[PDB]
């Protein structure tokens, strides 16, 4: 109600990462909270407080001396850090509401090595995918505006065994017209692509 | 967590009532209900301070009656239930009327509300073995697994290799995907990527599963329709490597 927050956000895995949160008419008697909320699930408390600054395990809080706008510090973001941030204000008494908020994105820096390869399924077997990996994290994957064609959106692994992280986009479709050469055609892949065939 | 919610979900036709519960911690004074749908925060619907109801807000209808009757747990009931009551329905509870005590939430009890119960499908998986291309490129090897088409979207997707859940090595999409985008009743889609070594995928004596968690109709609901009354259950799609 009485908090603003930039919809959402991207930031470097892994320094820290400042998520700001606008409240220019806040008191007082007001303190200043941050949730976060991952998928559907409930959302869970980050930290708190009044007028200040403060710390725990899972983060860092300033506050300005203006009481006006607050900091969220997660020391170290990381892939399992992504997920939406509410900053909310409450003085007691009252109800609490939520706004919108943020959305916070940590993105992975690459070596990279583009490819899109096709799968087939276990059983079965055509019926097959077609998989975009390996890309540098400023490619991103549109959607495909044919609607028997589906298209994932982004997706970050890592594989914390071999310390690698991949970026991937999956597509599919049961048109004969189909294929993987042209399933991420309508995105915008980089040039150096790697299409397989034997 | 540690505040708790029963059922974790329902699906209603139109007509019926529905009742939730909501389990706080222990001696906390404060109770509040929210309701959240896709993309959206939180919206208030009330709270309580020890059995007293406080604040609705002008969303509750009458059809909405929050109680608390020892100002311990709390029930939500939801009357003549509508299409436009699907959401999250959020607990929290706090220890005392106290800027530093924090609000702690429950996991939530998700209703979808129906038009009809036929147009509840659960999952079809299948896991989607990795390219000889990916393996002799990067000495890497992902499988793909899809979930299709189910409805509504309550279902939760794991790998599990040599039965233990992975997450290392894992992706799956933040939200589903529409099958039909189209329409009201659009079934849903959503896949996962597993990636390990090439070498781990080329040792037959692994194996790997694809699980989807699928919350549906409960056993006691009147079904009508030839296929399988689809219930709340795990579908799974399974793979071994290949010596290849």
């Known amino acids: 109600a009485k908090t603003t927050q930039p919809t959402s956000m991207d930031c470097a895995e892994g320094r820290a990462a400042n998520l700001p949160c606008n409240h220019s008419?806040?008191?007082?008697?007001?303190?200043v909270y941050w949730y976060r909320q991952i998928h559907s699930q409930g959302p869970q408390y980050i930290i708190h407080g009044l007028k200040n600054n403060e710390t725990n395990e899972m983060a860092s809080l300033i506050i300005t001396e203006d009481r006006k706008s607050s900091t969220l510090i997660l020391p170290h973001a990381t892939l399992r850090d992504t997920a939406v941030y509410y900053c909310?204000?409450?003085?007691?008494?009252?109800?609490?509401?939520f706004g919108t908020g943020t959305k916070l994105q940590v993105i992975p820096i690459q070596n990279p090595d583009p490819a899109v390869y096709q799968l087939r399924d276990s059983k079965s077997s055509d019926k097959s995918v077609c998989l975009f990996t390996d890309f540098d994290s400023q490619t991103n994957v549109s959607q495909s505006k044919d609607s028997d064609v589906y298209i994932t959106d982004k997706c970050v692994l890592d594989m914390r065994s071999m310390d690698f992280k991949s970026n991937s986009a999956v597509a599919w479709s049961n048109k004969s017209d189909f294929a993987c050469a042209n399933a991420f055609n309508n995105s915008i892949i980089p040039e150096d692509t790697f299409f397989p065939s034997p | 967590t540690g505040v708790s919610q029963n059922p974790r979900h329902k699906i209603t036709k139109r007509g019926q009532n529905v009742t939730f519960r909501c389990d706080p911690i222990s001696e906390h004074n404060r109770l509040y209900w929210y309701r959240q749908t896709l993309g959206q925060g939180p919206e208030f619907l009330t709270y309580?301070?020890?059995?007293?109801?406080?604040?609705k807000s002008r969303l509750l209808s009458d059809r909405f009656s929050a109680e608390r009757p020892k100002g311990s747990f709390s029930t939500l009931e939801i009357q003549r239930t509508e299409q436009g009551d699907s959401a999250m329905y959020l607990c929290?509870?706090?220890?005392?009327?106290?800027?530093?005590?924090?609000?702690?939430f429950g996991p939530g009890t998700r209703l979808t509300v129906l038009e009809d119960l036929k147009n509840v499908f659960p999952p079809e998986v299948a896991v989607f073995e990795p390219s000889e291309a990916e393996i002799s490129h990067t000495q890497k090897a992902t499988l793909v697994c899809l979930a299709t088409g189910f409805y509504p979207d309550h279902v939760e997707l794991s790998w599990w290799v040599n039965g233990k859940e992975v997450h290392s090595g894992v992706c799956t999409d933040p939200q589903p995907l529409k099958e039909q985008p189209a329409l009201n009743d659009s079934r849903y889609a959503l896949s996962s990527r597993l990636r390990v070594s090439a070498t781990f995928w080329q040792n037959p004596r692994n194996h790997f599963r694809c699980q989807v968690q699928f919350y549906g109709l409960s056993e006691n609901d009147e079904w009508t329709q030839d296929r399988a009354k689809p219930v709340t259950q795990i579908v799974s799609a399974e793979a071994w490597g290949r010596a290849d």
């Open positions: 309580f301070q020890n059995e007293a109801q406080l604040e």
């Open positions: 909310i204000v409450w003085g007691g008494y009252q109800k609490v509401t």
């Open positions: 929290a509870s706090r220890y005392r009327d106290d800027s530093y005590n924090e609000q702690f």
């Open positions: 008419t806040i008191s007082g008697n007001e303190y």
